[PDB]
């Protein structure tokens, strides 16, 4: 009555509440009340009626037509981080009303937090199938594709959303990572210039970004830095760096600024360009690490624990040290050992951050240096690096036995990775067993497949110190 | 499904060396130095001989050394078919075939369409460019000995209802970067409007099939001996940007990735091969590559040697798939075996002349999962169909 006739929402509500107590059998009572919670939100309490309500059994042939029960269980589930139990539901929703878009995207969703991640492809592919005007479904499908590895069709997607609804802000930021992200493989995998292009079309997105909707996650900046490596990576279309895109990008964005880290370094948006005759790349490096820093701990945010802080010191650290690395300048080392202790007191568990406090650690002393790579290694067995960058402290001081030692137990752990090899020729070529040195410059640079700088040029020169007065002769094809 | 099976054989299919292999949904077309273009039907019956379902043609006294065909639906309507060749004697012979009425036999009917100042053009290579969008009409790509590709435009009605009569457009040509100009040994045209010209220096260069402006050129290395390195054939990747050059040092074949987007190296397809006896070398082929195709789907690289191996490989790991070895006595019928040539030298292992891969649906085959195909023709005069095992 108050439902239909008398038009009183409260009453009505109290009333279908104080029904299903007593009945629990009837589907009206139900759907009215968890109706009236999923609008409010709380999912948590439609849950708790839907549940109810499926427990019971009591409307076995009611549910047989109608599943919102089960979606809503499910979704309460999804929102709640616990996707793996939604799965249950939405399957079994989907086996009622298989037309039902939103548990399709919902379940796709809750496969992607279970790597299963094809499997997302389909389901939200299906999605879409049924309603093409799903923007979601489509954003949802782009990501996993990127995931799996298409980017073609994935950006073919995100970008045919980005242009249907510019308005939003996941849909761009997804565009930019699945860019990026692109940027970074295709770099990888050796097609070096398509990286750049792909790096400006990304830049230049954010750009937009920040223009456009001045929209700030605290993911964007971290993009943006990934990118920029790019630039001073691979130097020879350094040139092709967008200063202007960038200062634009830097401009419009509001940072309430950090005068300890920005004193280290000596940046600043006014500061860095100011100065003349520095190459492109120590300015892609300067944008790098304001980039990095201007990264926002947003309003409204709640970080969990505070590992995000130390995350942001952390990507500063590794960008400071970065830029201290390409120029050999001692600021960056200062800013980039100052970083990873603002981000160590933050953490402390995290072995990623004592290896780069290691590296910047190598010359000013070993000892902490060596400490904080050994750290590393017992705080991540299973990392490669940790090793490999003590060896070449080892080597640094000239213990050559230590290092051959340490580059031993990586051939042992990962014989995979070209490093070990390359460093345990290098040992070799300096210890004058040269043959066999070359042998392993040349099996360093196979295993490379091109991925190191260090493995190609070691290997053309070791190529020629043994090939250019051994007497060859031009017929010699090998 | 990387795992090749052989169907269907000719053998004696021609009087001369089969230089070149094409084919599409209705049939195979394989031409030969004996100037004879032969059809070749695609939709067999079981155990049904290849050769009675063969048709052949007349075309040029020196002999044919390339062949192409096209076969679109035009209009709603109508049906297209056409197969373009080029004779020894340099001249681009155009032929439309149509089946017979209820025989279902093959008619030949030579099209003329280049005027007398093109005609005086020796042309090497050909490739047909379908109507995929690219512009709507479909075209005609050529090179010359003089290192030039010709691009034209093939327009089979007249001013848009519709009646048979075909005129092929001249939209421009493509002059080799480098001088003096070499000799354009062979052509491709991708899906995205791309030209890749080939010639005979190691240099390929990448051009606009739409606009006929050349973007860039690059070349292959170890130039120590100048008459060594020579591109035998190049092909462009579906799927990606990518494009396989196969080229020889001397003795050797090798096949070279390039990315097209800025047009860079990305990779180089080699396998253990023969050099200096007991050593072992990095080429693709002992002997030189003829000729490469892509599957469909652009994951696998089908390389056809003159060493007589037909080499499968994945492009996106750049290792080796698969092998397979031609022999003289892989035909199914005795009687067209050819063991030794009119020499008397051996041809137990005859090179590959050709290859090409056949789309799924083209070669129909009883009781099979319909599935990709491939088809190459080898020196011993042979014809040879496979498919590809696999589902759907």
Redesign the interface.
């Known amino acids: 009555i108050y439902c239909h006739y008398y038009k009183d929402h409260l009453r009505a509500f109290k009333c279908y509440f104080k029904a299903f107590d007593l009945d629990a059998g009837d589907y009206t009572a139900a759907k009215y009340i968890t109706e009236t919670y999923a609008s409010k939100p709380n999912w948590q309490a439609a849950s708790s009626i839907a549940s109810r309500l499926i427990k019971g059994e009591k409307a076995k042939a009611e549910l047989r037509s109608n599943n919102w029960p089960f979606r809503v269980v499910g979704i309460a589930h999804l929102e709640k981080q616990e996707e793996s139990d939604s799965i249950e539901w939405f399957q079994s929703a989907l086996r009622v009303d298989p037309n039902d878009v939103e548990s399709w995207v919902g379940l796709g969703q809750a496969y992607h937090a279970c790597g299963r991640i094809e499997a997302s492809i389909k389901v939200f592919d299906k999605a879409i199938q049924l309603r093409p005007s799903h923007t979601f479904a489509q954003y949802f499908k782009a990501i996993s594709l990127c995931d799996v590895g298409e980017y073609l069709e994935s950006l073919d997607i995100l970008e045919k959303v980005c242009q249907e609804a510019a308005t939003e802000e996941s849909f761009q930021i997804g565009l930019v990572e699945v860019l990026m992200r692109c940027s970074l493989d295709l770099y990888s ?6 990286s750049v ?1 792909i790096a400006k079309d990304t830049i230049e997105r954010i750009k937009i970004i920040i223009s456009e909707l001045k929209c700030e996650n605290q993911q964007v900046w971290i993009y943006l830095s990934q990118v920029l490596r790019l630039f001073i990576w691979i130097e020879s279309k350094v040139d092709t760096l967008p200063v202007e895109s960038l200062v634009s990008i830097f401009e419009n964005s509001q940072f309430s600024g950090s005068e300890e880290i920005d004193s280290v370094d000596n940046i600043k948006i006014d500061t860095l360009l100011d100065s003349t005759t520095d190459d492109n790349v120590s300015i892609a490096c300067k944008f790098l690490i304001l980039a990095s820093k201007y990264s926002v701990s947003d309003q409204k945010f709640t970080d969990i624990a505070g590992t995000v802080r130390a995350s942001y010191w952390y990507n500063i650290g590794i960008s400071e040290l970065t830029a201290f690395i390409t120029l050999k300048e001692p600021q960056y080392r200062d800013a980039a050992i100052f970083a990873f202790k603002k981000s160590i007191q933050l953490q402390s568990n995290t072995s990623e951050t004592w290896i780069g406090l290691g590296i910047a650690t190598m010359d000013i002393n070993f000892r902490v240096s060596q400490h904080c790579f050994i750290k590393a290694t017992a705080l991540e067995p299973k990392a490669t690096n940790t090793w490999f960058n003590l060896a070449m402290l080892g080597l640094k001081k000239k213990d050559t036995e230590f290092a051959q030692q340490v580059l031993n137990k990586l051939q042992s752990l990962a014989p995979q990775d070209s490093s070990p090899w390359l460093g345990m020729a290098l040992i070799l070529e300096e210890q004058g067993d040269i043959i066999g040195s070359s042998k392993l410059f040349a099996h360093s640079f196979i295993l490379s497949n091109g991925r190191s700088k260090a493995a190609q040029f070691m290997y053309a020169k070791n190529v020629l110190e043994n090939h250019i007065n051994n007497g060859d002769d ?1 017929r ?3 | 499904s990387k795992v090749f099976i052989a169907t269907a054989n000719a053998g004696k299919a021609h009087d001369a060396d089969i230089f070149s292999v094409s084919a599409c949904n209705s049939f195979t077309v394989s031409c030969s130095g004996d100037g004879y273009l032969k059809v070749w039907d695609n939709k067999l019956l079981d155990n049904e001989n290849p050769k009675d379902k063969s048709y052949s043609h007349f075309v040029h006294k020196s002999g044919l050394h390339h062949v192409d065909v096209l076969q679109a639906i035009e209009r709603d309507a109508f049906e297209l078919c056409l197969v373009a060749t080029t004779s020894f004697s340099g001249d681009l012979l155009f032929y439309r075939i149509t089946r017979e009425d209820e025989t279902k036999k093959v008619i030949f009917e030579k099209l003329d369409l280049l005027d007398s100042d093109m005609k005086k053009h020796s042309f090497w290579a050909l490739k047909w460019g379908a109507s995929n969008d690219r512009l709507l009409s479909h075209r005609l790509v050529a090179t010359d000995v003089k290192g030039t590709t010709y691009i034209w435009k093939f327009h089979p009605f007249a001013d848009e209802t519709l009646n048979w009569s075909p005129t092929l457009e001249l939209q421009g040509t493509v002059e080799s970067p480098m001088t003096p100009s070499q000799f354009a040994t062979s052509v491709d045209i991708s899906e995205r409007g791309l030209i890749a010209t080939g010639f005979n220096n190691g240099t390929v260069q990448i051009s606009e099939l739409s606009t006929l402006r050349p973007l860039y050129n690059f070349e292959s290395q170890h130039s120590m001996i100048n008459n060594s390195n020579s591109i035998r054939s190049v092909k462009f990747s579906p799927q990606g940007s990518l494009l396989a050059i196969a080229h020889d040092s001397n003795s050797f074949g090798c096949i070279t990735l390039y990315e097209t987007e800025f047009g860079e190296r990305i990779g180089s397809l080699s396998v253990p091969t023969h050099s200096s006896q007991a050593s072992l070398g990095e080429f693709a082929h002992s002997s030189w590559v003829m000729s490469l195709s892509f599957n469909d789907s652009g994951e696998t690289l089908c390389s056809a040697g003159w060493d007589g191996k037909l080499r499968f490989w994945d492009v996106k790991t750049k290792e080796r798939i698969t092998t397979l070895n031609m022999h003289c006595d892989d035909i199914e019928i005795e009687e067209d075996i050819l063991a030794v040539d009119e020499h008397g030298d051996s041809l137990a292992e005859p090179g590959v002349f050709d290859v090409k891969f056949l789309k799924k649906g083209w070669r129909s085959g009883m009781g099979a999962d319909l599935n990709e195909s491939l088809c190459c023709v080898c020196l011993d005069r042979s014809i040879r169909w496979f498919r590809e095992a696999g589902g759907k």
Request: glycine share 10%; aromatic share 10%.
């Open positions: 995998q050796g097609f070096l210039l398509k292009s031009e010699d094809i090998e």
